[PDB]
Design an enzyme around this catalytic site. Sequence first.
Site, short mmCIF file in Angstrom:
data_model
loop_
_atom_site.label_atom_id
_atom_site.label_comp_id
_atom_site.label_asym_id
_atom_site.label_seq_id
_atom_site.Cartn_x
_atom_site.Cartn_y
_atom_site.Cartn_z
N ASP A 67 0.25 -5.77 -43.26
CA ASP A 67 1.50 -5.47 -42.58
C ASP A 67 2.24 -6.79 -42.39
O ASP A 67 1.61 -7.82 -42.09
CB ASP A 67 1.31 -4.89 -41.19
CG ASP A 67 0.43 -3.64 -41.11
OD1 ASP A 67 -0.57 -3.50 -41.85
OD2 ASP A 67 0.69 -2.87 -40.17
N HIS A 69 5.81 -6.37 -40.89
CA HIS A 69 6.62 -5.91 -39.78
C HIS A 69 7.79 -6.79 -39.45
O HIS A 69 7.97 -7.17 -38.26
CB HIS A 69 5.77 -5.71 -38.52
CG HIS A 69 5.00 -4.42 -38.55
ND1 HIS A 69 5.62 -3.19 -38.57
CD2 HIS A 69 3.67 -4.18 -38.58
CE1 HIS A 69 4.69 -2.24 -38.62
NE2 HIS A 69 3.50 -2.82 -38.62
N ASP A 96 4.13 -1.21 -44.29
CA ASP A 96 4.58 -1.67 -42.97
C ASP A 96 5.31 -3.02 -43.07
O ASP A 96 4.92 -4.02 -42.44
CB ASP A 96 3.41 -1.73 -41.98
CG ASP A 96 3.05 -0.35 -41.40
OD1 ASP A 96 3.52 0.68 -41.93
OD2 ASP A 96 2.33 -0.31 -40.39
N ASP A 99 10.11 -2.53 -39.10
CA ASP A 99 9.86 -2.12 -37.71
C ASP A 99 9.11 -3.20 -36.91
O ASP A 99 8.36 -4.02 -37.47
CB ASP A 99 9.08 -0.78 -37.66
CG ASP A 99 9.97 0.46 -37.91
OD1 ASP A 99 11.22 0.37 -37.83
OD2 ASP A 99 9.41 1.55 -38.14
N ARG A 100 9.31 -3.15 -35.59
CA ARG A 100 8.69 -4.07 -34.64
C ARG A 100 9.33 -5.47 -34.70
O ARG A 100 9.98 -5.92 -33.73
CB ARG A 100 7.18 -4.12 -34.81
CG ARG A 100 6.51 -2.72 -34.73
CD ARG A 100 6.55 -2.19 -33.30
NE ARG A 100 5.67 -1.04 -33.05
CZ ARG A 100 4.71 -0.65 -33.88
NH1 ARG A 100 4.48 -1.31 -35.01
NH2 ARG A 100 3.95 0.41 -33.56
N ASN A 128 2.93 3.53 -42.88
CA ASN A 128 3.36 4.62 -42.00
C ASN A 128 4.73 4.32 -41.42
O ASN A 128 5.43 5.24 -41.01
CB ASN A 128 2.33 4.97 -40.94
CG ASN A 128 1.93 3.79 -40.09
OD1 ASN A 128 1.66 2.71 -40.58
ND2 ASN A 128 1.96 3.97 -38.77
N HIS A 129 5.12 3.04 -41.46
CA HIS A 129 6.48 2.67 -41.00
C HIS A 129 7.60 2.81 -42.06
O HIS A 129 8.80 2.74 -41.70
CB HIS A 129 6.51 1.30 -40.33
CG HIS A 129 5.98 1.32 -38.93
ND1 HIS A 129 6.81 1.43 -37.83
CD2 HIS A 129 4.72 1.29 -38.45
CE1 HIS A 129 6.08 1.47 -36.74
NE2 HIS A 129 4.81 1.37 -37.08
N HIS A 177 -2.48 1.73 -47.37
CA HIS A 177 -2.12 1.16 -46.07
C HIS A 177 -3.07 1.61 -44.96
O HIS A 177 -3.61 0.79 -44.24
CB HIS A 177 -0.70 1.56 -45.65
CG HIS A 177 -0.36 1.08 -44.29
ND1 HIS A 177 -0.01 -0.23 -44.01
CD2 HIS A 177 -0.25 1.75 -43.11
CE1 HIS A 177 0.22 -0.36 -42.72
NE2 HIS A 177 0.08 0.82 -42.16
N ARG A 225 -4.29 8.14 -32.52
CA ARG A 225 -2.85 8.06 -32.84
C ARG A 225 -2.17 9.42 -32.82
O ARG A 225 -0.94 9.51 -32.78
CB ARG A 225 -2.62 7.40 -34.19
CG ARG A 225 -3.20 5.99 -34.31
CD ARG A 225 -3.04 5.60 -35.77
NE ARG A 225 -3.68 4.36 -36.21
CZ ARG A 225 -3.03 3.19 -36.38
NH1 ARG A 225 -1.74 3.08 -36.05
NH2 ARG A 225 -3.67 2.12 -36.87
N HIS A 252 -2.96 -1.85 -41.49
CA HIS A 252 -2.64 -0.79 -40.45
C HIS A 252 -3.24 -1.05 -39.04
O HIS A 252 -3.00 -0.30 -38.08
CB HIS A 252 -3.06 0.59 -41.07
CG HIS A 252 -2.70 1.85 -40.31
ND1 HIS A 252 -1.42 2.18 -39.94
CD2 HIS A 252 -3.47 2.92 -39.97
CE1 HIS A 252 -1.40 3.38 -39.38
NE2 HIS A 252 -2.64 3.85 -39.37
#
Length: 315
Positions: A67, A69, A96, A99-100, A128-129, A177, A225, A252
């Site tokens: 990731d 991000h 990923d 995001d964030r 997943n993002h 991922h 989750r 992840h």
Amino acid sequence: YSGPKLEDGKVTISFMKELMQWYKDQKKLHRKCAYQILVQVKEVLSKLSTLVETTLKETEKITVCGDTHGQFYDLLNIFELNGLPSETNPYIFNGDFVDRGSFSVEVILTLFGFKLLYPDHFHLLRGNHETDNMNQIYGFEGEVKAKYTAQMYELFSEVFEWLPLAQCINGKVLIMHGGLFSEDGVTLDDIRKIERNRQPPDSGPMCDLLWSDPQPQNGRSISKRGVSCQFGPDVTKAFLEENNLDYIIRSHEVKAEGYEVAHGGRCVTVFSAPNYCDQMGNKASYIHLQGSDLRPQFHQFTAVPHPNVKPMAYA
Ligand SMILES: C[C@]1(C(=O)O)[C@@H]2CC[C@@H](O2)[C@@]1(C)C(=O)O
Ligand SMILES: [Zn+2]
Ligand SMILES: [Zn+2]
């Protein structure tokens, strides 16, 4: 506008270099250039199998990152530590991307640019993002609306749907991922056949590939989750055996040292966002693999300075 422009409507190494610097300096790629990259990479991605199958010859290497991000300045740092992507320095980024972090637009257009430049040596797998639900909440949609338009965001969403879900290197290492499956018996061919151009379902293998996590104990558990499952070492062993694989590499989850090797060697996590959200304090890593030796070699790295924008500023 005095920024980066495509040459004869296509990405070149000189454009990528100009883009990285433009972005380092906190400038914005013209909407028309961003559009051109999105339309062109959609075409490239839409031609790929859901399962990308790559052969590494014995002299060849590949770098696997987890990731990122939206941590653009750490992305630059990976390229400085490990070299720019090239036909001789291939990369896989394992989901990923956005995001964030609050430089998600810079990360994704930089990654897309390189996918365009080195389509056979620069690999992007969905996380997943890379999905609408998630972007609407965790900053990417907000960031795109702030820098471009709702319309640009819709285009990003469409491109994300075409990202492949997994990659298998030499019929031996599978990379995804999230992780493995809520049901036994899933094969590589099942992954190849997933109709992936959509937002993921609330259940099933496309969901699992993006969302599941390993657990230390045998069996499966309902995921904390709220989606997919946690899978034990027994699940991993059975999947590798059926599919004649050696191990899996997934991402992840944040890890203090940047990586983790679970299931007795069978399930590796790689995480490439150091000091995640300016708070975790974690190291990050990337993995090297070589055709002559597919065992993972971990390279750790730490956070570098970035401009004063807080994580999730656009969330
Ligand atoms: C929280 C994370 C995220 O939201 O993506 C971020 C931190 C760990 C990993 O990356 C994570 C758990 C993920 O699900 O992708
Ligand atoms: Zn993540
Ligand atoms: Zn994730």
